[PDB]
Amino acid sequence: QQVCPNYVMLRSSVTTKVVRNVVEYQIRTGGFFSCLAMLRPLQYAKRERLLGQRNLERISTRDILQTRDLHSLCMPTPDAPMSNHQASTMRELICSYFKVDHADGLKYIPMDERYSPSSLARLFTMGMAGLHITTEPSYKRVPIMHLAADLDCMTLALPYMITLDGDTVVPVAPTLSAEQLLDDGLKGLACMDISYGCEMDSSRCINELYCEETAEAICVLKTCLVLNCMQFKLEMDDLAHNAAELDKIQMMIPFSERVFRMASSFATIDAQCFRFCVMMKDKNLKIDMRETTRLWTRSASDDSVATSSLSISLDRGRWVAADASDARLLVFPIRV
Ligand SMILES: C[C@H](CCC(=O)NCC(=O)O)[C@H]1CC[C@H]2[C@@H]3[C@H](O)C[C@@H]4C[C@H](O)CC[C@]4(C)[C@H]3C[C@H](O)[C@]12C
Ligand SMILES: C[C@H](CCC(=O)NCC(=O)O)[C@H]1CC[C@H]2[C@@H]3[C@H](O)C[C@@H]4C[C@H](O)CC[C@]4(C)[C@H]3C[C@H](O)[C@]12C
């Protein structure tokens, strides 16, 4: 059963079965798990690295086009939500990273300045893996970032925001949306960290790999995470008003729990995702997708949840928001 056919992250499939009159669900969340894999650039490309250019040429062949194909091509996606936030700035980045002309940057980001955030992350993540997906169907080899190799053994990653209370890098709740970290020359990103680990055990922070070589790659990895957040937020905003698509699943409670897990990925870098996840644990996750949509649109209000009263800290490789002898949110690290 297809859900969100023309979405990138929400794109999911549901298989339902009966074994002696017992109701069984299975939800297959597709593009989402593809998108978060981009925290390990080489692991993402590992697949496509051993597919030739015919993999792409047979796609630009078609006239149907659709979302899943435009994504693979790293092009803007009509029939899907798109953003224009700091599009000017993002186009400059493409030209710098891939060292190409403005005429080619305009292929990725039209004059419209509308683009799919997950189609840029894929582009940059593939770029960090040493493959540039070009304007005209092709894979061109570019230098493989040493950072991408340095992280290619890690199976856990936990992004979080930090500040300083005096002389200690201390985790904080997000104040801003992910969308605001991209602007101002991407200088917001300094206050993001990503903790990687094996097994957490071998915990190593991406900010502790800071080097004049890796600084370029370290920023792109963060940008790709922010962009995948933007995509998720766009699709939830669009899903809210797509009353047609919404009605396919409005009562499928096991799906609300799945959307909750998806937002949890971004609940430490995006204030709206934070508040949205906090509200659902308060309700114990047993929520209709129609009500969940209402909670998503509610979370857009800063006063929706009292973030200011919550104490943030890390323990055991997991992110905790709590107050008054009772935790409100646990966020676990992202697989791969
Ligand atoms: C947390 C502090 C800023 C003080 C603060 O808490 N402000 C929160 C706020 O902006 O509201 C920032 C400012 C300078 C940062 C460092 C510099 O940008 C240089 C360098 C940049 C790297 O992107 C991440 C490591 C780090 C050492 C950074 C770690 C951390 O990112 C620092 C030490
Ligand atoms: C932070 C990284 C790496 C800087 C570095 O090489 N070492 C710094 C150091 O170690 O001292 C740089 C490399 C290319 C930069 C981008 C490009 O120059 C294009 C464009 C230029 C604008 O001035 C600010 C936004 C940005 C997207 C830039 C943001 C950011 O400024 C980038 C992504």
Residue numbers in the entry: 19 to 217, 230 to 366
Authors' account:
In the case of mammalian orthoreoviruses, two nonstructural proteins, σNS and µNS, initiate VF formation, and σNS recruits viral RNAs into these compartments. Our crystallographic and biochemical studies reported here provide a mechanistic understanding of how σNS forms filamentous assemblies by linking dimeric units through domain-swapping interactions of the N-terminal arms and further how such a multimeric association is required for the RNA helix-destabilizing and RNA-annealing activities of σNS. An important finding from our studies is that mammalian orthoreovirus σNS has RNA helix-destabilizing and RNA-annealing activities without requiring a metal ion or ATP, which makes this protein an RNA chaperone.
To provide additional evidence for the role of domain-swapping interactions of the N-terminal arms in forming oligomeric assemblies, we engineered a deletion construct, σNS-ΔN17, by truncating the N-terminal 17 residues of the protein. The σNS-ΔN17 mutant formed dimers in solution and also crystallized in the presence of bile acid derivatives. As expected, no helical packing was observed in the crystal structure. Furthermore, the σNS-ΔN17 structure showed that bile acid derivatives bind to the same location in σNS as the N-terminal arm in the σNS-R6A structure, suggesting that this location in the σNS core domain has an affinity for cholesterol-like molecules and that binding to such molecules disrupts filamentous helical assemblies by competing with the binding of the N-terminal arms. As anticipated, RNA-binding capacity and oligomer formation of σNS were abolished by the removal of the N-terminal 17 residues and, concomitantly, the σNS-ΔN17 mutant did not have RNA chaperone activity. From our studies, deletion of the N-terminal arm of σNS abrogates dimer-dimer interactions and precludes the formation of higher-order multimers.
